[PDB]
Write a protein that binds this ligand. Structure first.
Ligand SMILES: Nc1ncnc2c1ncn2[C@@H]1O[C@H](COP(=O)(O)OP(=O)(O)OP(=O)(O)O)[C@@H](O)[C@H]1O
Ligand SMILES: Nc1ncnc2c1ncn2[C@@H]1O[C@H](COP(=O)(O)OP(=O)(O)OP(=O)(O)O)[C@@H](O)[C@H]1O
Ligand SMILES: [Mg+2]
Ligand SMILES: [Mg+2]
Lengths: 334, 326
C-alpha cells in the first residue's frame, strides 16, 4: 500500500528540523503523486493532472536536504537537477531535456518508470529575468513545456534512435533562495504614499510566508512558469533554538559526524549544553544558515584534532562553553 | 461524412469554457481542411491559424481537445526546442518527423495531418538569432508547402496540405497594441488617456510585427483567432463543468480513499476571485484549491471514520478547516 503523508513527514523528521509546512507540502504532493499513478487511466474516469511545488527559502534552511531526505524512500525514480547548467536549445550548455535523460538513466532507461518519477530542480531562482537571455528567461521558457506534459526526445542508453518520454506524470519540485524577494514583498505590502492627502503605511520568515505570484513576477519569474508551479511552499529562516537541535537531533547531526571521526580513534567527544547554544548563536550571526554550524565546530576543534592522532592514552575530550566563547583548550580526560 | 463546424465546437465545449471565437475559428478551419482533402478544378491553398491569448486562457487545451476527434495525424510541436538548420537543437523538419511517426510513417497520411506549434511567441526577434528569428525563417518554407526530407522509420513529405495551428501568449503584445490605439500624448492638444480581451480582439499584423514576428510568417497565418482573458464567471464554470474540471480531479483523488469532497457555491466564487488575483488564468484555480485542501489531504489518510469533507466559503477566505463529517 501507500504510506500516508504523515509517514513521509515522519521520515523527513529524521533529517530536517523545522520547516513543518514545507515537509507537509512535499509529503502531500508525493502522496497525491502516488495516488495519481495508480488511478485508472481509461474509461469514464477523469484525467488527473499534477501539482508541482516551488520551494522558497533562505540559504541553509534545508530545501535541498528535504529533497535528498525525501528521496530515500520514494520508490519511484528520482533525480537532482541543476538549473544553472541549462541554456536555450541553440546554445552551449545543457538543454532542458537533459533532465529527462538523467531521470531516465536512474532507472536504467526503463521509460515507463522514468515517466513516473520525481524531479528536483535546484537553483531555479538563478534563471530569473533579473537581447536574448540565453541562460535566464530562455530557460524558464524552455522548461514550460517540460514541466507541463510533453514528449521529450532524449538520446538512447548508448552513444548519441532517440527515446520518446511522456513527461505528463513526472512531478517537478523546483526551489531556490530568492534572495531579493523580501524587498519586493515589503514594497507591495508597505506601499503607502508621500504628501498630505495621501496616507502613509506602517513599516524573512513572515515575508516569504505571504509570497504571491505578483512578487515572483516582479522578482523575475515569468507568469507562464509560475502558473505551472501551483504549490508554493516556504521555508523559514533557522533561529538560535532550531540551530541547537540541528547539532544533536538529526540522524546525521553535526555533532554525531565528529563523534564518529573521534571514534575512529579511541576518544569520546562530548559537548556541553552551553557550547551547543554558543555554537548555534555564533553560527546564526554568520548568515549562512545551518552551514555556519560547521565553521564553528571545525574552528573550536582544530587544535585538538591536530594533536588527537598523536596523543596516547586520551579517552574523552570535552568541549565546554568556554571553548566556544574563548580561545580555550578542551578538557582532556586520560 | 464530415462533421459540421458545429459538431467540432460541440466536442470542444466539453473541455473548454468560453472562448467562443477561438472555437469557431478552429472548427471552421478544420472543416475546411477536411473539405480540401476531399477535393480532387481550382487548386486550393490552406488557411493557417494563429492563436493569441493570455496565460491560462485555454489555447493548448483547445488543441488537445481538438486532437481527440481529428481523424488525421496530429502532433504538438514545441518552438522552444527549434533552432536553425546548422546549429545544435531540433531542425524544423523534426515537426514532420513527429507528424509522420504518428501514422507509422505512412507519408500519404502524414501529408494530410494537422500540426499545432506551441510557444510560437518564443521565437520572436527581441547577430545571428539562431533560436529566434532564424526559426521563424526556417518555418516559412515548412508552413508554406515544401518537400521535407526526413529520416527513415530519406523520406520526401509534401507539406502543401498540412494545416498549421500556431499559438502563444504574446505577453508584450498588449503593450504594443495600447501604444498604437491609445496615443497617450502630453500637451494641451494631446489625446491623453490611460484590458487584455479588448486589446487582443483588435490585434493587427502591425502589432505582431512590432512585437517581433516577421511579416513573412504573419502572412502565412492568415487566420488570427484570439482568446479572452478569463473573467470571474468563466473561472467558476472551469471548476465544475468541464469533463476534466478541477473539482472533479480532486473528488477523484479523495475517491481513491472513501471520502467524498464537496464545495459550496460560495466557495467556488471565492476561489475564482482569488485565482484572478494571481494572474495565471485558469491555472490559478489549482493554486487556491491546493492551498485550502493541504491540511485536509495531509490528515485525511490517517483519519478514521471520515466520510465527507465540506469546503465552505469561509474556508477559502479564512484559514479554517473544511468541515469534517464522520
Ligand atoms: N532544517 C534543517 N534541519 C537539519 N539540518 C539542516 C536544516 N537546514 C540546513 N541543514 C543543514 O545544512 C547543510 C546543508 O543544507 P542544504 O543543502 O539543505 O542547504 P541548501 O538548501 O542547499 O541551501 P542553498 O539553497 O543556499 O543551496 C546540511 O548539513 C544540513 O544538515
Ligand atoms: N477556457 C477554459 N476552459 C476549461 N479549462 C481551462 C480553460 N482555460 C484554461 N483552462 C485550464 O488551464 C489549465 C492549463 O490550460 P492550458 O494548457 O490550455 O493553458 P496554456 O494554453 O498552456 O497557457 P500558455 O499557452 O500561456 O502556457 C488546464 O487545467 C485547463 O483545464
Ligand atoms: Mg541546494
Ligand atoms: Mg500552453
Amino acid at each position: 500500500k501507500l504510506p500516508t503523508p504523515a509517514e513521509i513527514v515522519a521520515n523527513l523528521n529524521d533529517h530536517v528540523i523545522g520547516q513543518e509546512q514545507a515537509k507537509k507540502a512535499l509529503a502531500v504532493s508525493v502522496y497525491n503523486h502516488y495516488k495519481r499513478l495508480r488511478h485508472p487511466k481509461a474509461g469514464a474516469n477523469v484525467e488527473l493532472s499534477k501539482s508541482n511545488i516551488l520551494l522558497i527559502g533562505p540559504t541553509g534552511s534545508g530545501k535541498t536536504l528535504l529533497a535528498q531526505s525525501l528521496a530515500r524512500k520514494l520508490d519511484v525514480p528520482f533525480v537532482m537537477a541543476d538549473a544553472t547548467t541549462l541554456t536555450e536549445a541553440g546554445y552551449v550548455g545543457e538543454d532542458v531535456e537533459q533532465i529527462i535523460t538523467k531521470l531516465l538513466g536512474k532507472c536504467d532507461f526503463d521509460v515507463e518508470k522514468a515517466q513516473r518519477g520525481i524531479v528536483y530542480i535546484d537553483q531555479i531562482d538563478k534563471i530569473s529575468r533579473k537581447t536574448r537571455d540565453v541562460s535566464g528567461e530562455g530557460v524558464q521558457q524552455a522548461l514550460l513545456k517540460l514541466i507541463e506534459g510533453t514528449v521529450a526526445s532524449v538520446p538512447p542508453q548508448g552513444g548519441r534512435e532517440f527515446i520518446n518520454v511522456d513527461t505528463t506524470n513526472i512531478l517537478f519540485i523546483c526551489g531556490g533562495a530568492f534572495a531579493g524577494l523580501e524587498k519586493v514583498i515589503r514594497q507591495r505590502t508597505e506601499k503607502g504614499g508621500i504628501g498630505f492627502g495621501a496616507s502613509v503605511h506602517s513599516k524573512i520568515t513572515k515575508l516569504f510566508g505571504i509570497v504571491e505570484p505578483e512578487d515572483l513576477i516582479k522578482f523575475g519569474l515569468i507568469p507562464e512558469l509560475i502558473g505551472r508551479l501551483p504549490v508554493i511552499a516556504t521555508l523559514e529562516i533557522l533561529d538560535e533554538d532550531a540551530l541547537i537541535n540541528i547539532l544533536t537531533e538529526p540522524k546525521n547531526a553535526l555533532v554525531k559526524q565528529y563523534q564518529a571521526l573521534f571514534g575512529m580513534e579511541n576518544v569520546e567527544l562530548e559537548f556541553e549544553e552551553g557550547a551547543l547554544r554558543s555554537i548555534a548563536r555564533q553560527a546564526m550571526e554568520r548568515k549562512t544558515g545551518a552551514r555556519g554550524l560547521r565553521s564553528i565546530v571545525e574552528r573550536c576543534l582544530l587544535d585538538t584534532m591536530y594533536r588527537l592522532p598523536d596523543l596516547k592514552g586520551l579517552k574523552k575530550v570535552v568541549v565546554g562553553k568556554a571553548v566556544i566563547e574563548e580561545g580555550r583548550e578542551p578538557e582532556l580526560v586520560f
